[model samples]
Target: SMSYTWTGALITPCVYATTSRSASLRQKKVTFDRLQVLDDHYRDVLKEMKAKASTVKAKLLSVEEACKLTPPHSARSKFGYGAKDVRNLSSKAVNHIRSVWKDLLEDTETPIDTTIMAKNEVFCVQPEKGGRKPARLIVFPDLGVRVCEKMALYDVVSTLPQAVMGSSYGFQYSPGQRVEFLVNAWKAKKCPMGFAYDTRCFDSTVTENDIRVEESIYQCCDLAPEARQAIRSLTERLYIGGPLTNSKGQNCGYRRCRASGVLTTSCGNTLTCYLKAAAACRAAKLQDCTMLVCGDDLVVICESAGTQEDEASLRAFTEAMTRYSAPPGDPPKPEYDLELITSCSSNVSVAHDASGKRVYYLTRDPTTPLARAAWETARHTPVNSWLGNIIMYAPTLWARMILMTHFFSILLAQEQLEKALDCQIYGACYSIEPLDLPQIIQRLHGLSAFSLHSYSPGEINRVASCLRKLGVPPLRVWRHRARSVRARLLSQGGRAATCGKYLFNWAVRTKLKLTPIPAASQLDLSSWFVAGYSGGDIYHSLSRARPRWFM
Candidate 1:
């Protein structure tokens, strides 16, 4: 029989005879070992890396028998992943992810959903976090909200950053533990891009230039009042007492590990590729160019067309590098050295570390094709993989699915995925409608607010009313339809006006037209909820949005 591995339309297979289960073992071992011989097949220099399959292939079970084992989890079950799962994962359509990354079927015996869902069952750091009292929630932006739904959609969520770091431990988070609840409730009940943090940034800096939504909501409640001592105290104890801090000099080892400031907006487009190229060019003694790389054999082509058409030039270039020997070893002047140069646009110069000699070789692209390709591949792989996974999720259940089925079934099967890296979400730019604001705030009060004379409750009530007056419109070029034209009149995103303008612009200029709400109108509290959402159900958007209505 022929054994094969396939990616895209490319498939490589090796035919072998399997007389026993041991034969499968031998084949697996040989296949894994061959990767070292084909080391060029996977290179971090070009960055699209697959997780090591040594453990996966080490199983002694016959391939057929091994594939029969059921993975351990269910997509949704009692004692569910809940807030814990939500914090790390957006709701995933289970069966959908299985077809693509088909390697998943061969990977685990656990139920697909269980493996994909978080398994700890409880908080590792703070014991009390699972309870509803403290009312902890997280809300932040999904940065890549505008990208294709299946691609590299990343978003930053900062609400409970405090929850991650401890107040008790010296490992505290910046922006301390204040009333994150206020932020959550306000965001959940109002903002259009509230589910996304970058949109908030865009509004604050680029659009509205204000971060007053929290402040506006603050007027509605005594965020830190005496009656709610238990919630705050318990939260503080949990916050300061947990594992939020890193030991001095040690890195927390976040996944999607990267150099700091990798995502800061200041860098501009193609910045990651540029930085990698700058570093690699210096290492390879070459100037940067745009290349699509996979291991060492991949293509390095010019961004412009005419140059790549010259096979002779490419062949000559390869021969030159291969033929040139490293200068003889010894140290007075380091023998063989490489230099690189790059910037926002192109390679500026190259200099040798050993010879103090330099050459300025310019190109239309400053980023090496390898580096850019690596960054772009990684940036887009999840989305690409997602497109593939969506096809998998199709037991005909959902249109969107991202992870493999194993994630839902196995415990720690894919632990590395727990922390979000350059990960993102792509879809409609939805936001909470304003008419729904007052009712949500009222509900939040029911859920939050402890007694101080049975809770002055005025602040909670007042804030909602204040926000009720604010207009939390969708940004122009909107993603979600409105309850009415008036919806633009009431919603509040970090600032109220920006969201309205964006929706106004997007709806009016770019598209057929955005649906509008008449002005703030009555929102029926009971009707907005899906029948199941009446109480339990962490539903969509983060199995971690650090959020809930205040009531």
Candidate 2:
């Protein structure tokens, strides 16, 4: 099936529109030859996935419940109502949503109208290959269809994948848990060999057959008849593909590939990618393979057969995936060093904590993080990526020295230390209080995060090189600034003082004995890393009652 069919309508942007170089690039990437053949190993994995999925019991969410789950900043519908209207349960929004659900039940063949637009993404490094690449396309239905999607499939997506995929489902693990798994997997192997598999344009790689396969997996779950019907109808009508309309009510094209902004996009991609990768591993005859998958990103740790054989196996793995209709952007190379095997743009690195004990934590190249931080400093954005990097990479030397120092200084100057800021973790938006960072870091990363020191030379060099490239102040400058921020925080006392004492201990010669945070235990981080919500329209309100699916 063609990914898109154009109607001669020009793709336009509201604020700033660029050339179609990026779109043409995407078109070339998605336009490819595919010949997929599932073997016995694929069947075996499918059997196992279905078996686990069969054990899942999912229920439909009420119209009210789905409305409440909608994020306040979600995209508005063309029909006058917006996300705020939906979240507030405005009678107009609710009535339309109910009507949408009723329509889904009655009609199964009507094609839903989806608005497609180019999403403006922030990039620090200007691409050398293509100058100023165009934005990515985001195709989504109206707000009412989206709310209806939540009502029908929210519980199914939340529950089924975890049950079926088990530990291979990457979103279920936190950064710490992820690092631990990689370390344990590496050590367990007699001679470990690992590699990250990257699928070029993974969403477009999905076929109608793949979508139906995903539907079958969902059908395995014990569901209400209405929910089942809704799921089936949605899979056929919306999930497979739909018509693409521009913002000006013009018909731009029809999309036959995966809709990038649908609720099922994340979960569906995760399942399909995992399935193909698992099958490829078996086809390659890799020994004792352990996989960590988050959407299309995959890392496989397996027992090495020897350098020559390991390289050969990886080539076979790539070939198998290509046969499975998911080809790599760059063919995977076997990595003997665990630190070099990057997945989800992160790898496991070792650093010494306060006690000089070696601590393994997740860290990524600081180039993008620092670049985004510089941008966030100069301008205001909806979600703070710097805070997210700090929370996720708290133990990393770069995050603590630069991110913490810079952000805390800004917050201290503004006297908004207690203000809640929005940041994302594993795709779900969180309203985080800067004052509670000490506790949040302690709970998520542990006391080790507050005291981690003596970072590896590789890690330090990467951070330093990134700093130089970005023309940012050196580590010494950040260290000097942190001391001043530390003193100001201490003067404020209470949580501010605690943040000063724990987070900035490295900036000073005299360090506080970093004890277990008293408030850390009170944090409800259970739902923090349960799944990835990237384009799923998920938001975790601080005050809303916990959803049963979170459990």
Candidate 3:
């Protein structure tokens, strides 16, 4: 439950070279305008706080605490039990969070639902094909069709128009068309795999056969060569269907295009891909090592080594990458000095353990000899560490941001309801703020801009609700996710061992213990827990449930 102030203390001008400036933050004056609105719920909030405090205090002192609470060892770390305290403490912190989010809404320049806060970068990938950009591709999981129909649903077109955004590039389903409709449909809509974000929409006048999905692919090439091909394969053989079994009742697939051999699959089909890729690696007598592609960095951890020649080849085979070494002592700061979980060469990076701690070393491997030499030459020279300050933790900084936030808000919102109910019957009703016409109008404008593309009512609501819940404090799971990730990564062994598959898995499991969202109904937790949770139907209430405007 570190406040912005407590967090700011841990990170100051000394480390960052620039202290945060609140002057840049919008000035928020709690007008009686909205204060009066909350007046109805103020008593209820206080009452609920008192009850929770009493309950929390009792739990803090009791055998119940020992029975259900985190063990002492786990809580000893900064990211451990402290996160729980932060969660509880966040209730009192609601006022502060409210002030922050309230200020965000004061921009009279636009309406509430109209704000375009999602900083999605647009790329014109191979755009010369007579289209602005091909429609997005989404693979949605189907946990259950009938059950899905029973879930609480919300609409944006009416209730929260500003949250409305739509993009329907083009798609067609026809026998004569060579556009691979079956494959696309099966791949795109297949359930239990990944969530589908893109829905193909076309001019209704045209037959489904006339619709086409522009084949497109994007890659982060700093990966294993096999992984690179697998990605490309997955992109091309976009499976449109699941069980298009051949005449022999056998499955036939060129590639899930997912990663294969000597690498973990991206996820999904990658499990299969990983196994396949492993097979290929064994066949080729390639060292059994897995490679990770993180942005421009390629981290290869040697899981298994082969012959002396293979070892030598692997040693020097690392191409177009870098090698680095860390200083030999336990520093003034232990966290800053860890993280070397890799092999040499193909493992462009290596973390040679030394001095009872892991010192990460980054080196250079250029594609060409000249490039390699140039990088090595530059490496010997020291520049300003000042420049690296901007994003020292850049890799893990925004990790899991979307998934965390999406699930975070939903958990907290439910908690908010429980707390409100505990305090008063009309607590939720009182919490509702009368929509300021201007604010509403502005937000709507932002929503309209997003609407120029595709309708994502589910995503929009989760976002808005996240803002709302985070603005509420103790139940602010939205902000909690970031805190949890950051804390765990910086902890004694979290990020240090994250570079290897087994170590990474351990790190992940370790962190999961520290980050707790509001406990959900078993049913809801089953649906959420991992990546997504569209605050179900809040879009309906927020935008007044109109199909066009609200959505």
Candidate 4:
């Protein structure tokens, strides 16, 4: 199938710079000495980080216990038992997990390797210029290994990094919260120096040595003998990687690449990356010791060293990373101006909040979400990935009008407004109700969704720029579609009519009476949401400090 994106000039302002860049990245090998810290203070800080990694580890879990943790709707097992069956304590699923666990124990000498299968994902390469890129969801297909993954490492992966890195673990906050933290950190420093670091193919970049180093970190914790052995065996086979087969069933051969979708791949990369970064920060004598790391996404904000001094420090940081076997994706780019440099694909964009005060918030190109909404309208996905995005990004003009209008129209027409689709909001999973969208939207973006308001020039320009880049339809087209959707929704009586009244409230000149979601308390919100920020309860367990940010 051929894929095409809109190339309309008026909408694609942010799409060209990357599309025109060299397709291949340049690579060079650096000596281990380059990564070493010569200065004592930096060395001490690095040691402290290593010590921290040592303390974080997971305990062994029984096969049944491990299988119990697998969510009902987790990616289905291509083997015998499905994720649902496994979660429901189906004998077949339990037996399969047990067999896998036994294999882990018995195959002590032989390293356990996992197969890597690529799952399709979509990304907005240049929504401004109107291009979409397909992303890989490199995943481990072996059922046994997945069970082992849960047993040997799942718990520690949830809570440990935040323990060592503290607020530096970027996944611990939402984009809004992240921007707030960054702004506060910058303000505190007075003349704050900031930078965003990107790592190329971060998962595949994990080498055998990196995996072993990560395994060693587990050894630092007080773990049971079975847990230790399971950890070691799992590390040698699955973690370090072995044989991997692609879709063609031909030999893609031995694997060293980190499987992108696994729980541990994230935890492992974060541990290794943080270790390298913490050491580098100390070596450069960076002030504040405050850093935010979400997997391989890194953003550093600290007291400004003069331009020349900062440049040298960045180079040193790069070199330290090179030696640690975690080379910089490109280079460490330091900036005085905070707004322009993007972090986690979200740059600082200015828009007026309900207060009418100009607010600098985190935002990204809407290509993927818009592309996703378009795709969702045509088919049924296991989950409504678009709804959660609509709620979180409702503040954006495109999200507010287009996405909400599009999805709500589709659901109402299908008479599926009561359909509870599972979604991950702020890095936590939730089984959200479509009818509950108005409330969710209102909570996140304010009641502006129900009232008419003129968008600021900056907001309009950004929207215009994004539309042109993404090749999506103009706001006028969306409004027209929304009107038709509203008419149809209002035409339907009962629940659908109520939905149209509240959700499409901003579309009408007069506000509609909002109705409360029926028995929201009676709904099984378990696994749907965790109210107290970061970590624990069906979501991230990185302490209760903040919500996890979007990737």
Candidate 5:
């Protein structure tokens, strides 16, 4: 089936002109031949996934419960209702949502309406070989359909994948846990060989058959009859594919591919990608392959056969994936070094704590984070990437010195120490207070984040190189600024002081004793790493009283 069938009309953008460099690349990769052959390994993995999925018990969410999970700033629906209206439990929103659910149960043939828009994103690198990059497409259903989607699939997405995939499910781990998994997997191998697989336009690669397979997995669960029917209906009408309409209500095209913005997109992509990759591993005869998958991004660690054999095996794996319709963007290469194998835009690196014990933590190339930080400094962004980097990569040298110093200084100058700022973790936006950094860091990265020093040479070189390329200030300059910021925060003498004493202790010669944060024990980080919400329209309140299943 064709991924998209477009009309003569152009996909008009709300602002700015469109470009097709990215589109051309996608077009080239999207048109390909697939010849997947299932083997015993494939059957074994599928059986395991189905068995675990069968054990799951999912409940349908009430309209009110689903509404509270909506992000307040979510895109407004075409039906004259927005996320805030739904979150506030407005009568109109509730009525429409209930009606949508009823329609899902009754009618399965009518194609659901979905709006297609181009995403406007900021990029630091300019295109040299081609024209300006094209905007990414974001297709989503109406507000009512979205709420109904949450009501039907929220529990299933949250629980079933974990039950089936277990530790291999990437969304279930925080950055800390991810690094731990990678390290343990690496160490357990006699000769570790790892590689990151990059799928070419993953969403477009998903076939209608794959969607039905995903629905089959979901149906294995013990679900309410209404929920079961709704899932089946959604799979046929929306998930399989839908007609695309533009912002101006013109027929844009038809999509016979994965919709980029749906509740099930993440979970479905994860399942499909995992299934294909696991089968590919077995087809390649790779032994004891342990995979960490986040959406289409995948990394596999296994015992090395031999350099020549490993290289050939990876090529075979890529061939198998291509047959399964998920081809590679760049042919994957096996990496013997754990730190060199990047997945989810991050890699495991070594840093030392106060006692000089080696610690492994997750860190990414600082280029994008630094670029976004520079942009955030001069202009206001709705989401703060600097803050997010600090939260996720708190133990890294660049995050601690540059991102922490830069952002804290700005927050202090504005006297918004107590104000909540929006940042994302695993694609879910959370309203985090700046004052809670000390506790949040401890909870997410452990107390050693404060006193980590002597970062690995490879990691330091990457940061230094990125700083030079981006024309950002040196680490020394950031350290100098951090000491001043630390003193100011210390002077405030509360949570701010805790932030200074713990987060910025490395900036000073004499570090304070890093004790357990009292507030850290009080936090509920259970839902923080349960799943990836890249396009799921999820927002976590992070309140103490938040429901346990909100993620």
Candidate 6:
């Protein structure tokens, strides 16, 4: 069999000999001998990280305390109460939740009807190039349940598993950070290899038993009695299966779809999914102790015992998952070729690291980012998804220039350069500074974020292909705007000038010396940053945004 890998400039292929089970599973003692031990340094690093995670789930918060975290600028309530009322601890949100709680406790079998619908997402690669992805609809719990849902399981779902799984939780790191961790892991030991596994319709496949099991796990925790009962009642009415409502106010039907909007959807899936994978990992006897599991996105690196061992381990993994009623999208397949297996919908690509060494980076097709950029160019959005993408994908050439250039120009024109925008990376939210972006990008993507780089042949072709398809202007227009944008930013003076000087310096003939951002250094950025948004608003936007071709 053949596997392919890519350099920044080349795609290379390799062949593996065909072998049977016994031949492949033959334990490579040399491989295991070099594996990274659970050393003191590893323990200390993991221990500190786990301690950090502990604070997030240390105590269950009060309804008001959780409500306080909800932003004021969020969407107005459909029940005639505004988000402002909710944020200010008005009786409305509290009353709404209380009423929902009563119903949950009283009505054991009556299912709540949540709105069901589809959402648009672009294929990272164009669908024509085999990125053919269709829009997927989800079961969104109605207004009343969303509030009740938050009360029942918000903090538990968000923070507990991270505390439990520690570094194995994939959502905690950005693609860049994940890559950095992988590189370090490889250097730490021998036979460094891993692959991601996907479960088919993970949420949709969830059964009534799964929901009950999740609630049972919650009951074991030190939850307040009321909170515990609230969780149990919610499980029966919503999680197990609910009546789904349509936009026309019709009782569409009672169905068994997972309530996608509820807090437990994510938490429930993670707990159940982890149980299966954790059990499978044990059954398979995979070497690496820690893994990366975010919902259905699962990956692990282990001491390579040759092809036979991997094949056997994967078979066991499949068997375990099937027994648990959580079948994989495909059986686990190990990869020596890093770029071949897409993990978390991202694949590895090459770029120069700080010391000019070739580094593997997690990247994907820029179609969605580009499409969002095009939309942002002509329309104003409450959240700058494009800028978010730029920060996350700063290592990608298209994102660094195209996304950065266009957004700064727009913000500068609107005179909102200093206005803090909501940004999230590594599952933590932040109020990012437009002027401090140079530093932010540097921190996330390394110094290479500022360096000049031409697009590879493949990258260039994709850019051209996407523009024509989107009915947008050429990429050169963005490059042209960037030159003017850089001058204007520098003309602003102070920190904005500093950002312009270092970040866009590559656009000019001579560049300023890059200095580390002192202010950014002072920030304890371990927590995810979030912008001002209320709960009522998010679901509103979700339902409003129907299927529209992003291309």
| Number of the top lDDT candidate | 5
lDDT (Cα, tens digit) per residue for candidate 2, span 1-551? 77677786765664122333366555555554446777787778888889889999998999889888787788887778999889888988888888889889998988898987766556665565555555677788888999999899988888877898888888888788888888988999988999999998787778888889999999998899989989998998899888888878899878777888888988998999989999999999999999888889999999999989998999999888888788899889899999999888888899898778999999998877887777788788888999899989999989999999999988988989989888888777888889989988887788888888888999999999888877889999999999999999999888899989999999998888877866566667767877787777777754323334322
Q: Please give, for residues 345-464, the per-residue lDDT of candidate 4 as tens digits.
A: 776655654346665556666766776666666666655568767766666667767788878767766778877777666344566667666555554444544443455576677777
Over 296-398, each residue of candidate 3 has an lDDT whose tens digit, in order, gives 1122223233234444433233210001110111111101111222211111122222122322222211112122222322343222111111111111111
List, residue by residue over 466-508, the lDDT tens digit for candidate 6.
Answer: 6677665777776677789888988888778766776676677
- Clash pairs (backbone) in predicted model 2: none
In model 4, what lDDT does residue 40 have? 56
lDDT of 3 at 214: 9
Between candidates 4 and 6, the one scoring higher on TM-score is 4
Tell me which of candidates 1 and 4 scores higher on lDDT.
4
Stretches off by above 4 angstroms in model 4 are 1-46, 50-65, 68-79, 123-141, 222-224, 357-360, 379-384, 424-430, 439-456, 469-471, 477-505, 508-551
Indicate the TM-score of model 1.
0.19
Clashes of each: 90, 0, 75, 22, 0, 12
Write down the worst ten-residue block by lDDT for model 5: 15-24
- Candidate 6 stretches with Cα past 4 Å from truth are 1-58, 71-78, 102-109, 122-133, 330-332, 353-361, 380-382, 419-433, 442-448, 451-480, 522-526, 529-551
In order of appearance, the predictions have TM-scores of: 0.19, 0.95, 0.19, 0.77, 0.95, 0.75
Q: How many clashes (backbone atoms < 3 Å, residues ≥3 apart in a chain or on different chains) does model 3 have?
A: 75
Q: Candidate 2: how large is its RMSD? A: 3.3
TM-score: the better of candidates 3 and 6: 6
User: lDDT per prediction?
Assistant: 0.20, 0.84, 0.20, 0.61, 0.85, 0.59
Superposition TM-score, candidate 3 onto the true structure = 0.19
Model 4 vs. true fold: TM: 0.77
Task: Predict model 6's lDDT versus the native.
Answer: 0.59
Model 5 — TM-score against the truth?
0.95
- State in Å the error of residue 378, model 6: 3.9
- For candidate 2, the lDDT comes to 0.84
